[PDB]
Design a protein around this motif. Structure first.
Motif, short mmCIF file in Angstrom:
data_model
loop_
_atom_site.label_atom_id
_atom_site.label_comp_id
_atom_site.label_asym_id
_atom_site.label_seq_id
_atom_site.Cartn_x
_atom_site.Cartn_y
_atom_site.Cartn_z
N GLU A 1 0.83 -1.21 0.00
CA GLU A 1 0.00 0.00 0.00
C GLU A 1 0.87 1.26 0.00
N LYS A 2 0.32 2.36 -0.49
CA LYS A 2 1.11 3.58 -0.72
C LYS A 2 1.70 4.14 0.59
N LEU A 3 2.89 4.74 0.51
CA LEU A 3 3.43 5.48 1.66
C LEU A 3 2.81 6.88 1.66
N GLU A 4 2.12 7.24 2.74
CA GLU A 4 1.51 8.54 2.87
C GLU A 4 2.59 9.52 3.32
N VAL A 5 2.67 10.69 2.69
CA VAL A 5 3.71 11.64 3.12
C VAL A 5 3.13 13.04 3.23
N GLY A 6 3.42 13.70 4.34
CA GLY A 6 3.01 15.08 4.56
C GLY A 6 4.24 15.97 4.68
N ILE A 7 4.13 17.17 4.08
CA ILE A 7 5.19 18.18 4.18
C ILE A 7 4.60 19.48 4.70
N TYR A 8 5.33 20.17 5.59
CA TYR A 8 4.94 21.51 6.01
C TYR A 8 6.17 22.37 6.13
N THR A 9 6.10 23.60 5.65
CA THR A 9 7.20 24.56 5.92
C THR A 9 6.57 25.91 6.26
N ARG A 10 7.31 26.72 7.00
CA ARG A 10 6.84 28.05 7.38
C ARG A 10 8.07 28.93 7.56
N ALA A 11 8.07 30.08 6.90
CA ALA A 11 9.18 31.02 7.08
C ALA A 11 9.20 31.60 8.49
N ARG A 12 10.41 31.89 8.98
CA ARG A 12 10.60 32.76 10.12
C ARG A 12 9.71 34.00 10.00
N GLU A 13 9.08 34.37 11.11
CA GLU A 13 8.18 35.52 11.16
C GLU A 13 8.83 36.77 10.56
N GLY A 14 8.10 37.47 9.70
CA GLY A 14 8.67 38.64 9.06
C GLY A 14 9.47 38.39 7.78
N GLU A 15 9.86 37.15 7.49
CA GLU A 15 10.50 36.83 6.20
C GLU A 15 9.46 36.50 5.11
N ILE A 16 9.81 36.74 3.85
CA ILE A 16 8.93 36.36 2.75
C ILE A 16 9.39 35.10 2.02
N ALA A 17 10.54 34.54 2.39
CA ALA A 17 11.00 33.27 1.83
C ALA A 17 11.47 32.39 2.98
N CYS A 18 11.10 31.12 2.90
CA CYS A 18 11.48 30.15 3.92
C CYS A 18 12.88 29.62 3.69
N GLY A 19 13.74 29.74 4.70
CA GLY A 19 15.11 29.28 4.56
C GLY A 19 15.35 27.79 4.70
N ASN B 1 -1.59 8.74 14.95
CA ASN B 1 -2.99 9.16 14.86
C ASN B 1 -3.40 9.30 13.39
N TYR B 2 -4.25 8.39 12.92
CA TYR B 2 -4.66 8.39 11.54
C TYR B 2 -6.02 9.03 11.35
N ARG B 3 -6.56 9.69 12.40
CA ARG B 3 -7.76 10.51 12.22
C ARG B 3 -7.45 11.79 11.47
N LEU B 4 -6.19 12.21 11.49
CA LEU B 4 -5.70 13.27 10.62
C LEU B 4 -4.89 12.62 9.49
N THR B 5 -4.87 13.27 8.34
CA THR B 5 -4.02 12.82 7.25
C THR B 5 -2.58 13.23 7.57
N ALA B 6 -1.61 12.64 6.87
CA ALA B 6 -0.22 13.04 7.09
C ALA B 6 -0.05 14.55 6.85
N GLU B 7 -0.71 15.06 5.81
CA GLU B 7 -0.63 16.48 5.47
C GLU B 7 -1.20 17.33 6.59
N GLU B 8 -2.36 16.91 7.10
CA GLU B 8 -2.95 17.62 8.22
C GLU B 8 -2.08 17.50 9.49
N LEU B 9 -1.49 16.34 9.72
CA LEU B 9 -0.73 16.12 10.94
C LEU B 9 0.57 16.98 10.95
N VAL B 10 1.26 17.10 9.83
CA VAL B 10 2.54 17.86 9.79
C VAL B 10 2.24 19.34 9.93
N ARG B 11 1.08 19.77 9.44
CA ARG B 11 0.68 21.16 9.63
C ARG B 11 0.43 21.43 11.10
#
Ligand SMILES: [Mn+2]
Ligand SMILES: [Mn+2]
Ligand SMILES: [Mn+2]
Length: 192
Positions: free
Chosen positions: A1-19, A163-173
């Motif tokens: 069965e497929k590997l579920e993968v979630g990604i999340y990134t967020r820039a430092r506050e006040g930056e417009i690009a994530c390092g 916890n699989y009540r959230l998706t991987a995408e939801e969980l990493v967020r």
């Protein structure tokens, strides 16, 4: 069965690009998962983290030693970056991982909870005497968590990853939002 993968990134506050940068790449039953953190923050850090990710993708299936050595070469003269890569061969039931710098990896597996050892250094500036590749056995249901130091080592309650009540995408967020520092870039991958 497929590997579920979630990604999340967020820039430092006040930056417009994530390092920080993330890579998930699927190649013939082998999945690569990578996080890079460019030194510092802002667009110069982002440039370096993205160079590291792009370099890895171009070097897949040449082996982690080669992958990290080329990353270092492409990062000379930039901010530099720290990075982790996990290579999960689901068909053969094996994983390898390595880290240069302070990216955090945790692998929750049927064989136990395993934290790969990082090798100190900064890609582009000071390559470690030699890369320490951790190796383990993979079986379906094993979970991988990777995050930059935007999240403190050991901050994430392990059980939340099962916890699989959230998706991987939801969980990493949720992980990034609950545990992510706002004074640094944040990057997180969960695969299960
Ligand atoms: Mn950074
Ligand atoms: Mn699964
Ligand atoms: Mn950082």
């Amino acid at each position: 069965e497929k590997l579920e993968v979630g990604i999340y990134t967020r820039a430092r506050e006040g930056e417009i690009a994530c390092g920080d940068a993330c890579l998930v790449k699927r190649v013939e039953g082998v999945i690569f998962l990578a996080v890079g953190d460019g030194i510092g923050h802002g667009p110069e850090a982002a440039r370096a983290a993205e160079i590291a990710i792009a370099s890895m993708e171009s070097s897949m299936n040449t082996g982690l030693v080669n992958i990290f050595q080329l990353c270092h070469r492409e990062l000379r003269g930039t901010r530099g970056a720290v990075a982790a890569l996990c290579r999960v061969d689901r068909r053969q039931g094996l994983w390898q991982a390595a880290i240069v710098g302070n990216i955090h990896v945790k692998i929750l597996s049927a064989k136990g909870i395993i934290t790969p050892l990082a090798t100190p250094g900064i890609l582009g500036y000071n390559y470690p005497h030699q890369l320490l590749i951790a190796k383990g056995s993979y079986q379906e249901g094993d979970l991988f968590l990777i995050h930059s130091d935007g999240i403190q080592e050991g901050a994430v309650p392990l059980a939340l990853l099962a916890n699989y009540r959230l998706t991987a995408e939801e969980l990493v967020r949720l992980i990034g939002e609950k545990y992510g520092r706002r004074d640094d870039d944040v990057a997180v991958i969960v695969a299960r």
